[PDB]
């Protein structure tokens, strides 16, 4: 605990300089998420305050690309939900509570400009999908069908590439990998049902072959998702 507190203090001191904070922001994209997880797990007021200060320094306006860094942190590490949970929780330290409130306000301001489309784009870029609310939201798919097919179906091509990578990674058949594969299959089925023009692009890019390969997967959920995608493709 003492070593972790000293490391957090050193990180905050380094991040006090905007140039060093900006350099360390790109050094580890998951550093903010790890710091937030450590702050949530740790009950020490000093450690939580140091973690909050370190997180705020990375997203501070002094550091370069402060808005971009804050948006990326909120999209990847779920900074807004963690900050909202911390605000609801009661902290004995007044300085730690003030830092948590400031971080929550910054996260809310960053998320106000952002939308579900930005979160979906970040998830696609990170190649991580765990059945997000947008995947199960019919309205989101209906209002984002044109965006998916935009730029010569760039989003559809990215989804097809992610599905192909998951099929290549399907040998491991990990739980997270299986969930990602199922989410990708659901997204492909939605993009085939709506905007049918994307079906030809998916077939050209080997999406049908990937679905057929996933139909023989050992996992029951993956097989069911592949069967549903095949039914949406040419089936009833």
């Amino acid at each position: 605990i003492q070593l972790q507190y000293h490391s957090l203090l050193l990180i905050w001191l380094l991040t006090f300089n905007p140039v060093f904070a900006n350099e360390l922001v790109q050094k580890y994209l998951s550093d903010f998420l790890d710091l937030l997880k450590l702050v949530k797990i740790t009950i020490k007021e000093k450690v939580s305050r140091l973690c909050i200060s370190i997180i705020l320094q990375c997203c501070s306006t002094r550091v370069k690309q402060h808005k971009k860094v804050i948006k990326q942190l909120l999209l990847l590490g779920n900074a807004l939900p963690t900050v909202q949970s911390l605000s609801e929780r009661k902290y004995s330290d007044e300085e730690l509570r003030q830092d948590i409130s400031n971080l929550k306000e910054i996260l809310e301001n960053e998320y106000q400009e952002l939308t579900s489309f930005d979160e979906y784009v970040a998830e696609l870029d990170s190649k991580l999908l765990c059945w997000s609310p947008p995947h199960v939201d019919n309205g989101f798919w209906s209002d984002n069908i044109d965006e998916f097919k935009k730029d010569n179906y760039k989003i559809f091509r990215q989804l097809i590439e992610l599905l192909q990578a998951k099929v290549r990674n399907g040998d491991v058949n990990a739980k997270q990998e299986k969930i990602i594969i199922q989410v990708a299959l659901n997204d492909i089925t939605h993009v085939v049902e709506l905007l049918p023009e994307s079906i030809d692009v998916l077939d050209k890019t080997g999406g049908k072959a990937d679905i057929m390969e996933l139909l023989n997967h050992s996992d029951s959920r993956v097989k069911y998702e592949a069967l549903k995608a095949t039914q949406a493709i040419i089936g009833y």
């Binding site: 057929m212 139909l215 069967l227 095949t230 039914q231 493709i233 040419i234 089936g235």
Partner: protein
């Protein structure tokens, strides 16, 4: 699936039949040319009557 692929082939055959429907319309377009020729033939008969007068 294999059954779905066979169904797609039936749909493709229907799509070919849908293309053949245009060919059937194209086949019926030959009668349209004859019908258009018949329209001109009626005018030719009327013109011949006018020419005779």
């Amino acid at each position: 699936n294999g059954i779905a692929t066979l169904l797609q082939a039936e749909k493709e055959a229907h799509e070919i039949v849908s293309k053949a429907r245009k060919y059937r319309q194209d086949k019926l377009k030959q009668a349209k040319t004859d019908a258009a020729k018949e329209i001109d033939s009626y005018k030719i008969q009327k013109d011949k009557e006018l020419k005779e007068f």
